[PDB]
Amino acid sequence: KNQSIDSGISSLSYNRNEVLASNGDKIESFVPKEGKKAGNKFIVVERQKRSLTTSPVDISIIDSVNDRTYPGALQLADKAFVENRPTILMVKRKPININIDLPGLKGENSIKVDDPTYGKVSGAIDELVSKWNEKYSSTHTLPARTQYSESMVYSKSQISSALWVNAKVLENSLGVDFNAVANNEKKVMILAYKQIFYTVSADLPKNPSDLFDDSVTFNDLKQKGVSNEAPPLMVSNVAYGRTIYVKLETTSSSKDVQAAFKALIKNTDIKNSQQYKDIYENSSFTAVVLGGDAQEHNKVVTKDFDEIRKVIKDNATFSTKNPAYPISYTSVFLKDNSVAAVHNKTDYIETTSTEYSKGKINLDHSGAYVAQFEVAWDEVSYDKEGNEVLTHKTWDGNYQDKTAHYSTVIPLEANARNIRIKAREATGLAWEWWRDVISEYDVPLTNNINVSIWGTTLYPGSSITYN
Amino acid sequence: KNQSIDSGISSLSYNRNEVLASNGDKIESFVPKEGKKAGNKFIVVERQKRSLTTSPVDISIIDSVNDRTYPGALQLADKAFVENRPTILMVKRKPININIDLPGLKGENSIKVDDPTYGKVSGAIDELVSKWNEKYSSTHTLPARTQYSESMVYSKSQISSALWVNAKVLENSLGVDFNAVANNEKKVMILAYKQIFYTVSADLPKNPSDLFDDSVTFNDLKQKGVSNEAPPLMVSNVAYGRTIYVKLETTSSSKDVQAAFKALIKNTDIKNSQQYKDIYENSSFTAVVLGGDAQEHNKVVTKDFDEIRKVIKDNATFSTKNPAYPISYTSVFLKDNSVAAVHNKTDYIETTSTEYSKGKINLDHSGAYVAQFEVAWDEVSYDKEGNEVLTHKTWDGNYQDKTAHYSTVIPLEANARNIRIKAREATGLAWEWWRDVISEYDVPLTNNINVSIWGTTLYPGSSITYN
């Protein structure tokens, strides 16, 4: 009891740079490189351990709980604050001045709130908006201050730290299948278009005592959870608006996925490429709007990104005759009046992959001579340590006499490498001393390697073509 | 002294599939992935161990020692054979029939040689060639049977095994720098155009005794080196002709060097690709013609592959009047008349690389507003175990006011990844609540990334371009 509200808050000992800590997995076990056969394709998956360390100050608000966050609100810097379910500190308060950042208000934009509470501070904000609606009675619809963030998805913990959003808000709203992402079954990118209408700020106190009524004692605050493990915070600024989350999803395992997606967003000229056309045919785009101005559980799901663009643009403007809801805030530690950052630290497995596809070597011999072929290749596999293991393969028809007309096909698995095709006119003793009619090395694995041999013994001809 | 030649030779117990064997080196140990800085470039080298086994029957001949090899010559299957300096087995001989595979010579290509020695067989081969110049007195030149081989170079042992040449024969003639090749300071590729004029055969005996004069004993043989460690062989065929080796050299560490070289040899219009022209600027091409016709130590070293094609097309034929030089031969074991194969096995470190160049971010602010920026990137580096290590870097000017006209450059090292450039228009309380003028993620590293911001406070403009 020998403690005042100022000396008590001052006597709290905590690391301001680590109280609001968020830690994730570190991580699990994984093979650095893995070959997989699926469909008529071979996928290869490289993996790397990645470490993130963001220390943001803008903190997401979950709509379900916005009653808890409002300018001049008082919360505790505990693990619940980090989970976006803050513990409120409800006590008898001294008045506080709040200030809205809207245009044409330099000026006559602030207001004193005698009892800072959700209802009173909301009423105060609504009145500042009604004071703006008068004066600017023609233009009631304004543009939003848009911010853009983009990120490929690797884990629930990683995308949460990249986009600064609660992962369940992402998982429930957009429908994110984190196991397909981990298994490299799906590749997903998420966009966020944060649409800020305005921000309301609360004047900071000279000393913490300026927030609490004289009757309130440090022991009253200790009863409500104020501790070294739960220091007190004041909500300094709150941003009102909405956010639009976009999900680009694909079953494709190609290396060009992130590029293809980035092209679609900017609407660039690589977009038309046939490489990206197969990626887009197996892609789905999903957009949702979160805040309050949009109706709960709204959603667009399409294979036409022009539908997504429309949703983004349609929500770039807000009406000053409708109520705005908080989307994020910045809080300040009462002890030093310093901005409270949430120190995120997480490890994750960045997956990268490459798609290969089954191929075949078609042979045609219309030549007026006996020919023999030597077709050979390797098949790549990967051991537990991610190292390549080349199992050599050969065609069963090698070194066997063929005459006009002869045709065959030599299927190759998607994991075929180092292909080599050779043909020799059999005019003589043995293979070893014959003329090469065609002789190709490290042939690329295409869907059809059309090798033809023709002509006479004096003018033999050949060619190698691809489809 | 208790046995004849036949039973003596039969009494020899050796693994025919291993008595003639060559083994390469097993190591050195290596870092699987390494990042290297070379001027305005950052090179990444991925290393894979590769085992390689061949069992060829056509063995090379070193000109310096071509007198030890001729149809019907006896040699010992010891380690000197595998090093292309065979041990001759010189004893009193019975006659032998030899046949030449020159065209239109069915039932008239043979000749008996009473004392098969280098001089007498050479003489009989010359006799056959003069006898052919009488019967085909019009056509005094013929086309050579070309065999084409190609391979990138990784180690002395590997390229020797890939192209079936004595390492020193390439190392002397072409001038391969194996230490540069192994430190990825150069990428080299070698082509071999084995051109066969003709082959001469020796008829196989029903039993070993049919080769030896009756005065010869198995003790006489044993004394001349015959053992289970040195079983006796007979040269069954010898190929006469020439070989053109071609070296394609580069300082470029680009992943497209193999493709560029192939494009050049094939003569496709892909060679005109400016990507490949930067590679051919830092390339050298060399060609040598190891054959009887072409004068000793002859050589072309150019930067125009048409000078190399000239050498090839120029050597397409051979004159029948000119003597021919032995280039290759097949031997047979006297114990079973089975063709002797050299069992080659070799491990090698296959090196593969990519090139990254330095770049810079060019910021230009001409807009009618204060702007702040957030430029950041990661620098890729590889540890002892070849795993990536990203060190986060950020521009010192981040989060500082800038008014028109503001210009700057942010140089980026060639190992720069995950480049993110953001500019926000400064109207509101702080950074966290300002609208994006530009917001780019995972920007590709280019020599110049031009970020321009312009316009007014209420309608800003921007672009990002590359060079």
Asked if A439 lies within 8 A of B149 by C-beta distance, the reply is yes
Q: Nearest by CB to A258, from B199, B432, B442: name it.
A: B442
CB contact under 8 A, A439 and B148: yes
Chain B interface with A: residues with Cβ < 8 Å: 32, 48-50, 57-58, 101, 145-151, 196, 199, 201, 237, 239, 258, 262, 328, 330, 387-388, 390, 392, 424, 427-430, 432-436, 439, 441-442
Contacts of A258 in chain B (CB under 8 A): 442
Distance of alpha carbon B467 from alpha carbon B447, whole angstroms:
6
Tell me if A432 and B330 make a contact (CB, 8 A cut-off).
Answer: yes
Sketch out chain B's domains with CATH numbers.
Answer: 1-20+57-145+196-241+317-340 (3.90.840.10), 21-56+341-357 (3.30.1040.20), 146-195+242-316 (3.40.30.40), 358-467 (2.60.40.1430)
Q: What is the DSSP string of B379-404?
A: EEEE-TT--EEEEEEE-TTTT--B-S
- Are A101 and B429 a contacting pair at CB < 8 A? yes
User: What Å distances lie between residue B444 and A146, A149, A386, CA to CA?
Assistant: 24, 17, 27
Chain A partners of B433 at a C-beta cutoff of 8 Å? 58, 101, 145, 196, 199, 237, 239
Measured in angstroms, the CA of B384 and the nearest CA of chain A are apart by 15
Nearest CA-CA partner of A291 in A48, A6, A64: A64
Tokens of B282: 């830092």
Residue B151 CA from chain centroid, whole number: 3
The HSE-up count of residue A250 (CA atoms within 13 Å, CB side) is 24
Pairwise CB contact (< 8 Å): A435 & B146: yes
- The answer to whether the Cβ–Cβ distance between B433 and A101 falls below 8 Å is yes
DSSP characters for B11-22? Answer: H----TTTSSEE
Q: Which residues of A touch B258 (CB under 8 A)?
A: 442
Question: How many alpha carbons fall within 13 Å on the CB side of residue A428?
Answer: 25
Preceding omega of A405 cis (within 30 degrees of 0): yes
Give whole-number Cα distances, A386 to A290, A381, A413, B387, B400, in Å. 43, 9, 20, 12, 45
CB contact (8 A) between residue A433 and residue B196: yes
Q: What are phi and psi of B412, to 5 degrees?
A: -125, 130
Token pair of A431 as six digits: 């293979």
The three-class DSSP label of residue B241 is: strand
Closest CB to B148: pick one of A145, A433, A436: A436
Report chain B's terminal Cα–Cα distance, integer Å.
86
B199/A148 CB distance under 8 A: no
Omega into B405 within 30° of 0, i.e. cis?
yes
Pairing mode, strands A343-357 and A21-23: parallel
Rounded Cα–Cα distance for residues B402 and B408 (Å): 11
Q: Which of A152, A433, A457, A462 to mutate to test the interface with B (most CBs of B within 10 A)?
A: A433
**Residues of B whose CB is below 8 A from A429:** 101, 199, 201, 237
∠B270-B274-B280 over CA atoms, to 5°? 85
Closest CA to A12 of A224, A212, A229: A229
Nearest CA in chain A to B143: A458
Yes or no, beta carbons of A387 and B48 under 8 Å apart? yes
Shortest CA distance from B241: residue in chain A: A433
The answer to whether the CB atoms of A145 and B434 lie below 8 A apart is yes
Work out whether the CA dihedral A386, A392, A396, A398 comes out positive or negative.
Answer: positive
Q: Which amino acid is at B216?
A: V
Cα distance between residue A435 and residue A99, in whole Å: 90
- Sort out which chain A residues have CB atoms less than 8 A from B331's CB and list them: none
Burial of residue B163 (CB within 10 Å: 0-12, 13-18, 19+) is buried
Q: Give B-chain residues touching A441 at CB under 8 angstroms.
A: 149-151
* DSSP helix/strand/coil, B198: strand
Are A44 and A354 within 8 A, CB to CB?
A: yes
Q: How many C-beta atoms lie closer than 10 Å to residue A212's C-beta?
A: 24
For residue B390, what is the nearest residue in chain A, using CA coordinates? Answer: A50
Q: Give the count of beta carbons closer than 10 Å to the beta carbon of residue B31.
A: 12
- CA–CA min distance A261, chain B (Å): 12
Query: Considering only alpha carbons, which residue of chain A is nearest residue B58?
Result: A432
Resolution in angstroms comes to 2.7
d(CA A380, CA A384): 14
Name which of A441, A463, A465 to mutate to probe chain B: the one with the most chain B Cβ atoms within 10 A of its Cβ.
Answer: A441
Q: In chain B, whose CA is at the least distance from the CA of A60?
A: B432
Which of B162, B145, B95 lies closest to B124 in space, CA to CA? B95
Nearest CA to A317 out of A145, A132, A150 is that of: A145
Please name the amino acid found at residue B160: S
**Euclidean distance between CA atoms B184 and B250, whole angstroms:** 10
B29, B141, B148, B433: best mutation site toward chain A, by most A Cβ within 10 Å? B433
B-chain residues within 8 Å CB-CB of A330? Answer: 432
Inter-residue contact B231 to B77 (CB < 8 Å) = yes
Closest alpha carbon within chain A to B147? A436
Inter-chain CB proximity B442 and A199 less than 8 Å: no
Q: Fill in the DSSP letter of residue B273.
A: -
A47 strand-pairing partners: A351
Handedness of CA A314, A318, A322, A323 (dihedral sign): positive
- Searching chain B, which residue's CA lies closest to the CA of residue A316? B435
Task: Give the pairing type, strands B283-291 and B300-302.
Answer: antiparallel
Q: Check: CB of residue A121 under 8 Å from CB of residue A67.
A: no
Q: Do B435 and A258 touch (CB under 8 A)?
A: no
Q: From chain A, which residues contact B within 8 Å (Cβ)? A: 32, 48-50, 53, 57-58, 101, 144-151, 196, 199, 201, 237, 239, 258, 262, 328, 330, 387-388, 390, 424, 428-429, 432-436, 439, 441-442
Are residues A202 and A234 in contact, defined by beta-carbon separation less than 8 angstroms?
yes
Q: Chains A, B: CB contacts under 8 A, how many?
A: 89
A48 CB neighbours in chain B (<8 A) are 387-388
What SS3 string covers chain A? CCCCHHHHHHHCCCCCCCCCEEECCCCCCCCCEEEEEECCEEEEEEEEEEEECCCCCCEECCHHHHHHCCCCCEEECCHHHHCCCCEECCCCECCEEEEECCCCCCCCCEEEECCCCHHHHHHHHHHHHHHHHCCCCCCCEEECEEEEEEEECCCHHHHHHHHCCCHHHHHHHHHCCHHHHHCCCCEEEEEEEEEEEEEEEECCCCCHHHCECCCCCHHHHHHCCCCCCCCEEEEEEEEEEEEEEEEEEECCCCCCHHHHHHHHHHCCCCCCCHHHHHHHHCEEEEEEEECCCCCCCCCEEECCCHHHHHHHHHCCEEECCCCCEEEEEEEEECCCCEECCCEEEEEEEEEEEEEEECEEEEEEECCCCCEEEEEEEEEEEECCCCCEEEEEEECCCCCCCECCCEEEEEEECCCEEEEEEEEEECCCCCHHHCEEEEEEEEECCCCCEEEEEEECCCCEEEEEEEC
Which residues of chain B have a CB within 8 Å of the CB of A439? 147-149
Nearest to A230 by CA among A23, A70, A81, A71: A81
